[PDB]
């Protein structure tokens, strides 16, 4: 709402880079945590059986 | 209170030199711009010079370019004016003024204007005055008022003061401005308007005082015949 | 304005409680340079300070 596209684009690109890398960090940590929970669920299924 | 006490003026022969001083008190001297302005006797104002704090940004009027040098001082806070190669046209009363053109663009004018110092460029020497009375006509019947006065002649320099009868008679005292003669010496006349009937009864004594020479004279006036 | 302070002691006028139309002043071409940092010279009318 305050910058023209030719210069707003640089600020937006910086914000895009920061939020996309933050999202990638969240997703990677979620993938590892999901693998840990999956191992626990497999152990729980084995214990149940 | 702003105070620009000026000094250093006096009598100089043509082609000589003289330094004027302008002390300052009551304000920040180092943060203001100082000027010199002179006025010929009975003529209009003419700017002389200006120094805006720095010892290199000095500006002078066209009539004094090259001959006059301006300078200032820290510590005691005074202003100086060097005069070289003076001519008869340079006789004037020199004033030092203020100015805050530096930052302020409103008080561009000369806020104070010192009282001024008198500089006379002449080869004549200092001389005390000669005093002569102004006698009336005894058979004057034009009116009930007769005119009397004392003529102070050939004094140099100014100023003079006039009193009468040690202050006991002050009615009708009139002092005239001094004039310059062709002889190079100044002249002045001080007169008093009085009733005519008191010429032969009351004693009229005029008192003239001149501070630069500390001369006091008392003269009595008597009608003729 | 008629005067303008010197650069060592520049003037600072405070503007508040008023409506600032920047489209008229921008649409003049009388200016030798007009560089805006922060916000674009355009659309500045839809902003508040």
């Amino acid at each position: 709402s305050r910058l023209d596209p030719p210069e707003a684009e640089v600020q937006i690109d910086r914000l895009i880079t920061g939020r996309l890398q933050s999202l990638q960090t969240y997703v990677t940590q979620q993938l590892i945590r999901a693998a840990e929970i999956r191992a626990s669920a497999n152990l729980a299924a084995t214990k149940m059986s | 209170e702003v105070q620009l006490v000026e000094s250093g003026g006096g009598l100089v022969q043509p082609g000589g030199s003289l330094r004027l001083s302008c002390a300052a008190s009551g304000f920040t001297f180092s943060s203001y711009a100082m000027h010199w302005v002179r006025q010929a006797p009975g003529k209009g104002l003419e700017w002389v010079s200006a120094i805006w704090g720095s010892g290199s940004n000095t500006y002078y009027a066209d009539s004094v370019k090259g001959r006059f040098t301006i300078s200032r001082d820290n510590s005691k806070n005074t202003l100086y004016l060097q005069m070289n190669s003076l001519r008869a046209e340079d006789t004037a009363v020199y004033y030092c003024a203020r100015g805050r053109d530096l930052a302020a663009f409103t008080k561009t004018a000369f806020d104070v204007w010192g009282q001024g110092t008198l500089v006379t460029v002449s080869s004549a020497s200092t001389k005390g005055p000669s005093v002569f009375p102004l006698a009336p006509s005894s058979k004057s019947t034009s009116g009930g008022t007769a005119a009397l006065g004392c003529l102070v002649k050939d004094y140099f320099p100014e100023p003079v003061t006039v009193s009468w009868n040690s202050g006991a008679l002050t009615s009708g005292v009139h002092t005239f401005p001094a004039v310059l003669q062709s002889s190079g010496l100044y002249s002045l006349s001080s007169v008093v308007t009085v009733p005519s009937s008191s010429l032969g009864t009351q004693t009229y004594i005029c008192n003239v005082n001149h501070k630069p020479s500390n001369t006091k004279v008392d003269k009595r006036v008597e009608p003729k015949s | 304005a008629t005067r303008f302070a010197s650069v060592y002691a520049w003037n600072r006028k405070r503007i508040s409680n008023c409506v600032a139309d920047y489209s008229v002043l921008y649409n003049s071409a009388s200016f030798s340079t007009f560089k805006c940092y922060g916000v674009s010279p355009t659309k500045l009318n839809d902003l508040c300070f």
Side-chain angles (χ1 to χ4, degrees), chain B residues 53-71:
Chain B
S54 300
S56 57
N57 63 6
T58 74
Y59 294 100
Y60 315 96
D62 193 62
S63 309
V64 298
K65 284 175 71 175
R67 310 192 290 115
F68 282 15
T69 301
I70 193 170
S71 165

Side-chain angles (χ1 to χ4, degrees), chain A residues 1-8 11, chain C residues 38-44 46-47:
Chain A
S1 172
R2 76 187 200 197
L3 298 196
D4 266 320
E7 51 275 30
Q11 298 292 308
Chain C
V39 298
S40 174
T42 311
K43 326 189 184 215
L44 201 158
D46 83 332
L47 288 155

